Amino acid sequence: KLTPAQSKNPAKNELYLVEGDSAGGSAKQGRDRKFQAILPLRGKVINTAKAKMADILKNEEINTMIYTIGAGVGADFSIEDANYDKIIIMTDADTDGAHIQTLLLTFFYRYMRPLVEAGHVYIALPPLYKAYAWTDGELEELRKLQRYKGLGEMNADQLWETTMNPETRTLIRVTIEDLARAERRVNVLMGDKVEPRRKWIEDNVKFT
Amino acid sequence: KLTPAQSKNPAKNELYLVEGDSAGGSAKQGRDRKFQAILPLRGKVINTAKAKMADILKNEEINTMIYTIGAGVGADFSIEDANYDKIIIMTDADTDGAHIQTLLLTFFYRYMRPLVEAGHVYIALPPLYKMAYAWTDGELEELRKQLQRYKGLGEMNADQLWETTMNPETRTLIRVTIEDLARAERRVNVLMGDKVEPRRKWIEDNVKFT
Amino acid sequence: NIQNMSLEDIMGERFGRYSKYIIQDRALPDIRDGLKPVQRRILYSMNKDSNTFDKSYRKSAKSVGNIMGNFHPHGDSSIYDAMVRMSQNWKNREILVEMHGNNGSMDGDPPAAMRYTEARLSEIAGYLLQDIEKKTVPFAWNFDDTEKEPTVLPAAFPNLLVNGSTGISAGYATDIPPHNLAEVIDAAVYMIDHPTAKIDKLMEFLPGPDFPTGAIIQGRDEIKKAYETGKGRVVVRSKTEIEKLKGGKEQIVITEIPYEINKANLVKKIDDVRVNNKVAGIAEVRDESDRDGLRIAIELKKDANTELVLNYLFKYTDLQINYNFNMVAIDNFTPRQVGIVPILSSYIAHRREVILARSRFDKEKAEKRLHIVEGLIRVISILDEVIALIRASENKADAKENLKVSYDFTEEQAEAIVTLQLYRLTNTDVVVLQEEEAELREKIAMLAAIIGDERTMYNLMKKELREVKKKFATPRLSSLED
Amino acid sequence: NIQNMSLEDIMGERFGRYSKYIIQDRALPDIRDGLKPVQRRILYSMNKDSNTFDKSYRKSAKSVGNIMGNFHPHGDSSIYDAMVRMSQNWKNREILVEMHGNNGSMDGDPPAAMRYTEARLSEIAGYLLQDIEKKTVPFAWNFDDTEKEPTVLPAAFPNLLVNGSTGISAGYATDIPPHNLAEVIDAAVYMIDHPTAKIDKLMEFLPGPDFPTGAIIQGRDEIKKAYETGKGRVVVRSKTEIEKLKGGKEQIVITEIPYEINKANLVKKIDDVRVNNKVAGIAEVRDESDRDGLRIAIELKKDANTELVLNYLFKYTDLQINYNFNMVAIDNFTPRQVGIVPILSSYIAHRREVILARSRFDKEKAEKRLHIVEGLIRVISILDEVIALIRASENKADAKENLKVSYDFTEEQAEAIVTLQLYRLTNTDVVVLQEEEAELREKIAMLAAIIGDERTMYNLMKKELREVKKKFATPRLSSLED
DNA sequence: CATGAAT
DNA sequence: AGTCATTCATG
DNA sequence: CGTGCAT
DNA sequence: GACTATGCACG
Ligand SMILES: N[C@@H]1CCN2c3c(F)cc4c(=O)c(C(=O)O)cn(C5CC5)c4c3COC[C@H]12
Ligand SMILES: N[C@@H]1CCN2c3c(F)cc4c(=O)c(C(=O)O)cn(C5CC5)c4c3COC[C@H]12
Ligand SMILES: [Mg+2]
Ligand SMILES: [Mg+2]
Ligand SMILES: [Mg+2]
Ligand SMILES: [Mg+2]
Ligand SMILES: [Mg+2]
Ligand SMILES: [Mg+2]
């Protein structure tokens, strides 16, 4: 599963959570091995609100993930005894990419709350176009095109330049602004109860 | 792995050794569940002339053939305690089909000599063509007076298979008999043996590259 | 180099993003052609490729890869598994794909791998695509922005009800059972003539679902409820005969089972009853189905209350199940729970859009020619002078200009005229042309009427629906009771 | 109902069938284009599909499936795997396929699945296909009998030596190492002037293999033996610098490794020595390769004999290995152990048949058009009369007998004239035609010369081989020693 | 617990 | 070439 | 033992 | 979507 950094270093070391064995592969290649580890997420991450805390611990991606971070889960969780200064969720810029970010984020909010509130949890924004553009508004300005359908079609030297280089990468930091407004938001989108979600979707999703 | 026949009976029961899971499954559907059993041969089969009897007993296909025919293997092989009265090798009509037939046969010869020597080992001739059906390019050209060119077993639907190859009263069927016992040990050893030079030479002497 | 966002704000843009997509563009059928985008892409691709009911089968892998590179940017497996399902005659009431080779069984053993099977569109499938080449349906760009693709098919029959849909998404799900082609068409034809038709009356034509696995559907009241609100729980029970056996013993013989039920798992779950002896009296369970018949014999013992056993199996197995209607579909880009009425309504509205679109197209074609033909009929009256004008012109462009200015030909005719091959000069027969001028004027009048008269139009629509019914109609399989 | 067969008279027929096939049509390359059939089909197919270096990438699944349904009736994965290799620049000296996305590594890890990757022919492969549209190569029917495929490609460079092969059949196997494209061409060119060239002379142009993986090759003697008999045993050793570190510690650094060797295993197997203390003084092994450069640091302890460590690693690991030539290929349909001369000769031979075939094709084209142009030149001076004559004809055919009978045009000329679009009568310019007629006569002259003079043809073949060398030539990567 | 398009 | 797990809603 | 087209 | 075993020839 895990491809580890060469040297153990809490202050610098970064953990990359890639959506896919395929992209997990371009990551092993493009990365800087001295301080960047790679853990592929092979398939959709379990929902850690809907499922039972029984089947939650018997989950491969949940085990190797609590164990590859070395702080343990729940409230038996020491953020001081971590293994990475940063943890980076890197997915396709697609819908399912989005969904995955959404499930990983609930797991960390639910079972490693310190990590997110300590600002150690990030999300990599890969490019949408190719100079490189992230917005359809950043492209038309670059017209003065190859359209990336996912990480799988990007080459190692490119991935590094655009989204893995700690000096060339755009990088989103997850923060908890209003703790209690984040418990509702999360419990409604990811909870066991369907009806509240439908209403949320109805009220916020513009089908046009 | 094995799909058993619904009624135990060494007198009628047939064992079908099918090339591959896809077609093994088509056969599972086309068979007559009362007396026909299917055993998929998933992949190319181990050369029991080259490999070490150790690595042999540890190969899942050979083990699950020997232990479903219920007669053990080798010299501790009671023919009377078999399960089937007809063992049918059924492979695509392609080269690699031909290759498998080569490997399965060398095995029975080598580790179940009594089973072939008694005419219990058959070979199904699937149809090569459909316009009705024809087996020989000659049996074909006669139909065009009275073409789907079957590229393998996996391209046929079950009611098709049953009618042309599995139905006992409609199937053409080969019987492997041994004529010259000492002239087989040599034909088999040349072709499937560990030594390479003889086999190269036999190919040079018999195969016409034209 | 690094910018932060709220958890509250990141789960928003992510889940809304995904939700919207998986609702509009994955899991749920367009209310008019009954297709989820993957199925549509599958049919449109195979069709563009001429892989049709009347032509040799293609290797599935060729088709699938072509779908994947042109339209559906996802798993080759997902795409295949979809293709395979549209070809299983026990999941679809009317299969849209014909596949040579192992494509599975009611025993639910997996289909042969994409590399083995061949396939083509079924004849009926073509009817879903009828007239697509006449600009009858809105097209969008593919992911590539290299090729257009249809957003909905022309649906010459009403697939949504005929074939069904299921049906899991986010905030919504969908379960619509299949129905008899003829019954559905009969209902739609009635609604065409009677827009404000009430359910009770539509149900004289379309009395219930018609599963392709047949069997017995119980609950006339809930069928009504469902056709009304789009939700409703009905019962589906297996077709059972009872045979006497030479011994004072009896045999329960199952011949049809409930839609979506796995025959192999049923047989197992029943033998489990026998093996655990939860119920007294089961002697043997025998799946006796062959390539041309379904048949499970449950041999009972002597002195064994066969009513008691049959009832137990109906309760504690899938020998009998409940089927839940949850008719959700996409009307106007939106997920919408709908019953029999907005469904037929949306269909009819669609077929109207199509027939109008199609007639505008054919009309525009007829006109463009009739225009040309007029020009030609003239040219002959003045052949000598037109050749002289070209002879005197400097080049295609100048010649066209001269025909316009000197003889009032239009561009379109000046093009036609100037690009005629020399041999055409041999001819002077104005009649044949005139015959075509007539045939064309008539065709246009016919098509204009359709476009300008709501009733003429609807009449055509009925006519067509009926042809489809005469051609593809087949008897019920599932019986009804309450 | 049943026929009997000898065990002998069977294995004979069966194994002979598989023997023949897996030799001629699977595991061994054609001596001319250097391709096994699966490779040739991939190439021919992608090319037919316009999937070339100059155009966008196609999703791989699309390329594969088209291959599998048009030419190669085998596993989709085998086809993909093959295609992937042709794109890996550490196995091919001159890669034939370019591929976007994870396509493996020297660390041996697996490429992304066929659904993720995009691909297209490299510009070089284009030259492997050059002129194929021109009837320059023998075609056969495909398994379907629906489409013709090529049995060999035109090969505008000598692929077999340049990219190598390998190689496992029945009774024969093959290992041919890759070679510097420019050197092979230099050899071929000499041999063209000097048919009877001894191995020694050729070796002044083609001194040995050039591995894409680089490194040091040792054994001039065995290289000759190989280039002479097809078999030989040479030694490949890793390229190695020695860096000083602070604290009196040294570091063995590896920058290139031996062909066909897995970097990742090599690294373990070395650390394996350190762990087992098999040789005194290793501090730590570290693969420090990164996206732009290979690099293995074997840092050793203080006061450690660095020449002892290096020597041990060379002997007991794969930091240095034996490459064995086993140059086998298919000549006149037969497997054939072959050295440098049977190869280059066969190539030249083939390059001949192709240039000759091509030159007829083009001549014949140019002849036919010259014929039409000759006719169009006369027409101009009699334009009016011709128009008049057509006007006076009853129809198309009659216009031609009339053009013939009255002006001795040929059928082919008459047809051309009579099918001319009217606007052409504004293009009445003899001198442009007279310029083409000249262009044309010269072209025909040049090609006829090629066809009727072996020397003239061979110089064409050299002009071209050189053009290719100038265009694709690159520096040696592997150094030699003896 | 199975459903069917998605990872 | 089959096999393994997860999302999502529903009874 | 590992290579690469095949099952 | 990565994993697992075979054939075949060769050091
Ligand atoms: N962690 C899970 C156990 C095994 N498994 C599957 C799988 F079972 C099926 C599939 C598929 O059937 C499948 C398909 O294309 O149909 C794809 N995948 C991969 C993308 C996840 C599958 C995966 C992913 O690997 C990991 C997960
Ligand atoms: N009995 C064997 C163990 C597992 N295995 C494979 C396999 F490992 C790989 C493969 C493949 O890589 C592979 C491919 O398409 O490249 C195909 N097969 C199947 C036809 C045998 C494989 C099979 C067959 O299944 C049985 C055998
Ligand atoms: Mg994706
Ligand atoms: Mg085959
Ligand atoms: Mg799957
Ligand atoms: Mg029940
Ligand atoms: Mg494989
Ligand atoms: Mg060594």
XYZ file of C-alpha atoms in Angstrom, chain C:
482
model
C 1.300 29.329 -2.881
C -1.385 28.430 -0.296
C -4.972 29.613 0.472
C -7.467 28.444 3.141
C -11.211 27.645 3.077
C -13.832 26.690 5.705
C -14.806 23.080 6.370
C -18.400 24.343 6.071
C -17.535 25.963 2.734
C -15.426 23.065 1.349
C -18.063 20.364 1.969
C -20.511 22.722 0.258
C -18.805 23.166 -3.134
C -17.789 19.466 -3.070
C -21.065 17.724 -2.195
C -23.203 20.108 -4.218
C -20.835 19.557 -7.160
C -21.111 15.756 -6.917
C -24.795 15.592 -5.975
C -25.891 17.696 -8.970
C -23.850 15.512 -11.348
C -24.842 12.100 -9.986
C -28.524 13.213 -10.130
C -28.700 14.925 -13.533
C -26.059 12.867 -15.299
C -25.623 9.370 -13.872
C -28.136 7.436 -11.827
C -31.499 8.705 -13.010
C -33.320 8.377 -16.378
C -34.490 11.277 -18.531
C -38.283 11.115 -18.219
C -38.787 11.062 -22.012
C -36.441 8.401 -23.486
C -35.957 6.366 -20.308
C -32.172 6.389 -20.525
C -29.416 7.252 -18.089
C -26.571 9.028 -19.900
C -24.370 5.877 -20.059
C -27.098 3.834 -21.784
C -27.788 6.737 -24.212
C -24.098 7.055 -25.047
C -23.949 3.323 -25.608
C -26.847 3.355 -28.116
C -25.815 6.551 -29.906
C -22.246 5.312 -30.320
C -23.120 1.853 -31.620
C -25.544 3.495 -33.983
C -23.030 6.036 -35.314
C -20.877 2.983 -35.923
C -23.503 1.111 -37.956
C -23.480 -1.712 -35.416
C -27.150 -2.380 -35.995
C -29.572 -5.306 -35.849
C -29.136 -5.914 -39.596
C -25.362 -6.141 -39.732
C -22.638 -8.481 -38.424
C -22.030 -8.409 -34.673
C -18.972 -6.410 -33.471
C -16.515 -7.405 -30.746
C -17.799 -5.772 -27.560
C -14.334 -4.388 -26.844
C -14.412 -2.372 -30.088
C -17.743 -0.812 -29.204
C -16.861 -0.125 -25.576
C -13.578 1.561 -26.377
C -15.327 3.741 -28.922
C -17.914 4.819 -26.391
C -15.122 5.543 -23.936
C -13.104 7.713 -26.322
C -15.962 9.629 -27.865
C -18.677 10.131 -25.253
C -18.532 8.386 -21.864
C -15.337 9.250 -20.039
C -15.353 6.446 -17.399
C -14.698 2.773 -16.663
C -14.543 0.429 -19.609
C -16.081 -2.100 -17.192
C -18.979 0.154 -16.126
C -19.721 0.823 -19.784
C -19.603 -2.892 -20.621
C -21.639 -4.028 -17.609
C -24.269 -1.524 -18.817
C -24.112 -2.807 -22.403
C -24.478 -6.378 -21.096
C -27.520 -5.469 -19.024
C -29.355 -3.838 -21.935
C -29.035 -7.286 -23.550
C -30.263 -9.534 -20.767
C -33.774 -10.556 -21.721
C -34.694 -11.172 -18.047
C -33.854 -7.620 -16.888
C -35.213 -5.747 -19.898
C -38.819 -6.261 -21.076
C -37.626 -5.264 -24.495
C -33.802 -5.659 -24.886
C -31.977 -2.874 -26.736
C -28.738 -4.756 -27.285
C -28.179 -8.137 -28.897
C -25.096 -9.952 -27.598
C -23.562 -13.176 -28.960
C -21.928 -15.198 -26.173
C -22.108 -15.647 -22.414
C -23.901 -12.548 -21.153
C -25.054 -14.083 -17.908
C -28.061 -15.989 -16.651
C -30.985 -15.688 -14.237
C -28.574 -17.620 -12.025
C -26.457 -14.488 -12.076
C -23.186 -16.026 -13.067
C -21.100 -13.239 -14.572
C -21.147 -12.567 -18.325
C -18.131 -13.495 -20.474
C -15.473 -10.782 -20.402
C -15.638 -7.885 -22.858
C -12.918 -9.595 -24.932
C -15.113 -12.600 -25.794
C -18.560 -11.251 -26.558
C -19.983 -9.632 -29.684
C -22.983 -7.301 -29.889
C -25.177 -4.984 -31.934
C -28.262 -2.838 -31.391
C -31.555 -4.737 -31.377
C -34.123 -3.827 -34.024
C -36.284 -2.091 -31.413
C -33.258 -0.059 -30.284
C -33.252 1.517 -33.707
C -36.694 2.832 -32.998
C -35.257 4.710 -30.003
C -32.831 6.356 -32.472
C -35.269 6.895 -35.298
C -34.757 10.213 -37.068
C -31.752 11.322 -34.932
C -30.073 12.267 -38.210
C -32.792 14.855 -38.882
C -31.945 17.384 -36.158
C -34.863 16.238 -34.002
C -33.129 16.408 -30.618
C -30.737 18.883 -28.921
C -27.059 17.979 -29.060
C -24.286 19.054 -26.677
C -20.521 18.837 -26.819
C -18.763 15.757 -25.548
C -16.160 16.085 -22.779
C -13.552 16.605 -25.544
C -15.381 19.543 -27.090
C -14.578 17.623 -30.289
C -17.884 15.877 -30.995
C -21.567 16.659 -30.409
C -23.839 14.053 -28.758
C -27.602 13.839 -28.267
C -28.964 14.889 -24.838
C -32.122 12.793 -25.279
C -33.116 10.259 -27.965
C -36.138 10.635 -30.323
C -37.893 7.713 -28.528
C -40.249 6.274 -31.179
C -41.615 4.086 -28.397
C -41.976 5.072 -24.685
C -38.940 3.315 -23.178
C -39.248 4.633 -19.587
C -42.271 2.518 -18.807
C -41.606 -0.326 -21.228
C -38.123 -1.120 -19.902
C -38.052 0.482 -16.499
C -35.201 1.998 -14.522
C -33.282 1.562 -11.267
C -32.078 3.789 -9.684
C -29.681 4.950 -6.889
C -28.363 8.477 -6.555
C -28.059 11.140 -3.829
C -31.109 12.491 -2.029
C -33.080 10.447 -4.562
C -33.476 6.948 -5.987
C -35.610 5.365 -8.677
C -37.462 2.117 -9.216
C -39.727 1.924 -12.244
C -40.812 -1.569 -13.345
C -41.151 -2.590 -17.031
C -44.481 -2.728 -18.851
C -46.108 -4.275 -21.893
C -45.221 -2.316 -25.075
C -48.753 -2.658 -26.436
C -50.450 -1.622 -23.182
C -48.290 1.484 -22.791
C -48.829 2.543 -26.376
C -52.586 2.017 -25.984
C -52.572 4.367 -22.983
C -50.478 7.005 -24.731
C -52.766 6.915 -27.761
C -55.753 7.486 -25.446
C -54.100 10.382 -23.685
C -53.237 11.893 -27.054
C -56.954 12.036 -27.872
C -57.874 12.828 -24.255
C -55.228 15.032 -22.527
C -57.108 15.303 -19.244
C -57.523 11.545 -18.929
C -57.967 10.203 -15.368
C -55.838 7.335 -13.973
C -58.815 5.034 -13.569
C -59.423 5.266 -17.316
C -55.762 4.990 -18.358
C -55.643 1.787 -16.285
C -58.182 0.173 -18.647
C -55.358 0.176 -21.179
C -52.319 -0.075 -18.904
C -53.450 -2.189 -15.923
C -50.020 -2.815 -14.436
C -46.338 -3.667 -14.751
C -45.370 -6.534 -17.038
C -42.168 -8.132 -15.782
C -40.147 -9.987 -18.444
C -39.727 -12.802 -15.904
C -43.530 -12.796 -15.705
C -45.235 -14.196 -12.601
C -48.083 -12.840 -10.465
C -48.510 -9.179 -9.453
C -50.919 -8.696 -6.533
C -52.448 -5.366 -5.450
C -54.688 -3.489 -7.877
C -55.101 -0.768 -5.250
C -51.366 -0.077 -4.770
C -50.783 -0.180 -8.529
C -53.324 2.671 -8.678
C -51.631 4.458 -5.757
C -48.352 4.171 -7.592
C -49.620 5.314 -10.960
C -51.020 8.306 -9.043
C -48.193 9.422 -6.746
C -45.335 7.416 -8.226
C -44.883 5.438 -4.994
C -46.615 2.172 -4.057
C -45.761 -1.306 -2.691
C -47.054 -4.287 -4.655
C -46.580 -8.057 -4.223
C -44.894 -10.314 -6.778
C -45.422 -14.042 -6.405
C -44.025 -17.025 -8.282
C -46.103 -19.109 -10.724
C -46.721 -22.452 -9.023
C -48.292 -25.706 -10.209
C -48.662 -28.820 -8.049
C -47.841 -32.316 -9.357
C -48.805 -35.586 -7.687
C -46.083 -38.248 -7.513
C -46.546 -42.043 -7.445
C -46.418 -42.482 -3.666
C -49.038 -40.245 -2.090
C -46.385 -37.530 -2.216
C -46.781 -34.117 -3.821
C -44.461 -31.725 -5.663
C -44.532 -27.920 -5.766
C -43.321 -26.796 -9.200
C -42.145 -23.230 -9.761
C -42.164 -22.017 -13.380
C -41.865 -18.227 -13.104
C -40.161 -16.103 -10.451
C -40.141 -12.484 -9.213
C -38.353 -9.786 -11.201
C -34.773 -9.113 -9.998
C -34.581 -12.406 -8.159
C -31.540 -14.632 -8.527
C -32.669 -18.202 -9.408
C -29.534 -19.884 -8.013
C -29.738 -18.031 -4.672
C -33.450 -18.783 -4.374
C -32.919 -22.475 -4.928
C -30.174 -22.372 -2.274
C -32.233 -20.397 0.255
C -35.050 -22.937 -0.194
C -32.814 -25.984 0.269
C -31.667 -24.136 3.431
C -35.243 -24.357 4.671
C -35.091 -28.082 3.920
C -31.650 -28.470 5.497
C -32.418 -26.548 8.701
C -35.927 -28.042 8.816
C -37.521 -24.733 9.921
C -40.591 -26.153 8.291
C -41.435 -29.849 8.245
C -41.898 -31.799 5.035
C -39.341 -30.882 2.348
C -37.760 -33.974 0.768
C -35.623 -32.483 -1.973
C -35.071 -29.215 -3.850
C -34.221 -29.611 -7.576
C -33.423 -26.823 -10.021
C -34.558 -28.487 -13.248
C -34.233 -25.526 -15.597
C -32.728 -26.208 -19.014
C -31.770 -23.882 -21.870
C -35.457 -23.640 -22.841
C -37.523 -23.671 -19.665
C -37.572 -22.629 -16.022
C -38.488 -25.301 -13.480
C -37.816 -25.840 -9.798
C -39.310 -28.948 -8.226
C -39.841 -28.947 -4.473
C -40.483 -32.599 -3.688
C -42.392 -32.959 -0.403
C -42.579 -35.987 1.889
C -45.573 -38.285 2.398
C -48.071 -36.758 4.858
C -46.649 -33.252 4.563
C -48.941 -30.246 4.663
C -48.199 -28.681 1.294
C -50.255 -25.546 1.931
C -48.197 -24.926 5.067
C -44.852 -25.280 3.288
C -45.792 -23.172 0.255
C -46.976 -20.418 2.568
C -43.779 -20.528 4.584
C -41.598 -20.272 1.469
C -43.715 -17.344 0.180
C -43.067 -15.551 3.481
C -39.477 -16.408 4.438
C -37.948 -16.476 0.944
C -38.056 -14.536 -2.292
C -40.387 -17.112 -3.772
C -42.513 -14.047 -3.030
C -41.249 -10.496 -2.563
C -42.631 -6.993 -2.336
C -41.910 -4.652 -5.230
C -41.695 -0.944 -4.413
C -42.486 1.686 -7.015
C -40.344 4.807 -6.636
C -40.828 6.475 -9.988
C -38.304 9.297 -10.165
C -36.978 10.632 -13.458
C -35.513 13.799 -14.951
C -38.078 16.342 -16.183
C -36.583 19.749 -17.047
C -33.092 18.971 -15.700
C -34.699 18.263 -12.376
C -35.241 15.059 -10.386
C -39.038 14.629 -10.131
C -41.275 11.976 -8.558
C -43.984 11.220 -11.078
C -46.826 8.839 -11.672
C -48.371 7.478 -14.857
C -49.664 10.849 -15.956
C -46.774 13.324 -16.173
C -44.819 10.395 -17.676
C -47.172 9.879 -20.603
C -47.589 13.608 -20.791
C -43.852 14.269 -21.064
C -43.501 11.507 -23.593
C -46.249 12.875 -25.785
C -44.804 16.408 -25.518
C -41.455 15.016 -26.601
C -42.769 13.060 -29.579
C -44.419 16.327 -30.591
C -41.127 18.237 -30.378
C -39.489 15.504 -32.447
C -42.193 15.233 -35.115
C -42.211 19.022 -35.449
C -38.398 19.149 -35.627
C -38.289 16.291 -38.077
C -40.858 17.809 -40.380
C -39.043 21.180 -40.406
C -35.908 19.334 -41.424
C -37.424 17.288 -44.232
C -39.252 20.408 -45.340
C -36.124 22.542 -45.393
C -34.498 19.829 -47.546
C -37.400 19.584 -49.959
C -37.434 23.351 -50.311
C -33.684 23.762 -50.951
C -34.074 21.364 -53.839
C -37.410 22.607 -55.207
C -35.570 25.936 -55.342
C -32.682 24.401 -57.339
C -35.111 22.631 -59.644
C -36.883 25.897 -60.415
C -33.556 27.431 -61.471
C -32.727 24.433 -63.704
C -36.105 24.520 -65.428
C -35.249 28.127 -66.309
C -31.681 27.506 -67.392
C -33.054 25.230 -70.157
C -35.221 28.048 -71.532
C -31.988 30.030 -71.855
C -29.235 27.391 -72.041
C -27.358 29.032 -74.877
C -27.125 32.393 -73.137
C -26.139 30.867 -69.765
C -23.235 28.933 -71.271
C -22.147 32.140 -72.991
C -22.249 34.021 -69.698
C -20.036 31.431 -68.061
C -17.803 31.345 -71.107
C -17.580 35.137 -70.629
C -17.080 35.028 -66.851
C -13.617 35.050 -65.236
C -14.007 32.285 -62.652
C -16.549 30.465 -60.531
C -17.107 33.542 -58.362
C -17.591 35.967 -61.280
C -19.896 33.534 -63.090
C -22.226 33.140 -60.117
C -22.284 36.928 -59.779
C -23.259 37.263 -63.465
C -26.058 34.732 -63.279
C -27.445 36.648 -60.321
C -27.172 40.083 -61.922
C -28.012 39.240 -65.513
C -30.789 36.663 -64.901
C -31.917 37.025 -61.255
C -30.808 33.543 -60.220
C -30.124 33.340 -56.508
C -26.861 32.226 -54.937
C -28.051 28.680 -54.206
C -29.145 28.186 -57.848
C -26.135 30.003 -59.269
C -24.044 27.512 -57.329
C -26.024 24.537 -58.569
C -25.884 25.786 -62.170
C -22.206 26.617 -62.269
C -21.166 23.248 -60.767
C -23.178 21.141 -63.264
C -21.065 18.650 -65.221
C -20.736 19.338 -68.972
C -22.774 16.288 -69.970
C -25.864 17.886 -68.362
C -25.821 20.274 -71.342
C -27.010 17.299 -73.420
C -30.423 17.352 -71.829
C -33.432 19.517 -72.675
C -36.250 17.546 -71.012
C -38.165 19.926 -68.829
C -40.861 17.383 -68.000
C -39.013 15.020 -65.692
C -37.873 18.103 -63.759
C -41.452 19.400 -63.645
C -42.645 16.009 -62.299
C -40.082 16.452 -59.492
C -41.228 20.063 -58.944
C -44.747 18.702 -58.328
C -43.754 15.797 -56.058
C -41.779 18.392 -54.053
C -44.529 20.942 -53.716
C -46.875 18.206 -52.501
C -44.361 16.931 -49.932
C -43.977 20.454 -48.551
C -47.687 21.062 -48.263
C -47.975 17.799 -46.354
C -45.178 18.723 -43.998
C -46.293 22.304 -43.541
C -49.731 21.085 -42.431
C -48.138 18.923 -39.747
C -46.255 21.912 -38.476
C -49.182 24.308 -38.636
C -52.013 22.032 -37.450
C -51.820 20.590 -33.939
C -54.344 17.868 -34.905
C -52.791 16.703 -38.176
C -49.616 16.487 -36.093
C -51.095 14.466 -33.219
C -52.787 12.200 -35.818
C -49.414 11.379 -37.328
C -48.045 10.720 -33.872
C -50.832 8.205 -33.174
C -50.356 6.580 -36.590
C -46.676 6.052 -35.816
C -47.182 4.766 -32.267
C -49.615 2.195 -33.660
C -47.191 0.972 -36.347
C -44.662 0.423 -33.544
C -47.234 -1.550 -31.577
C -48.208 -3.696 -34.597
C -44.578 -4.492 -35.100
C -43.190 -5.144 -31.637
C -46.255 -5.979 -29.621
C -46.097 -9.112 -27.576
C -48.408 -10.719 -24.983
C -48.331 -10.246 -21.179
C -46.096 -12.440 -19.083
C -47.044 -11.301 -15.600
C -50.656 -11.869 -14.576
C -52.636 -9.423 -12.379
C -54.766 -10.013 -9.234
C -55.840 -8.259 -6.009
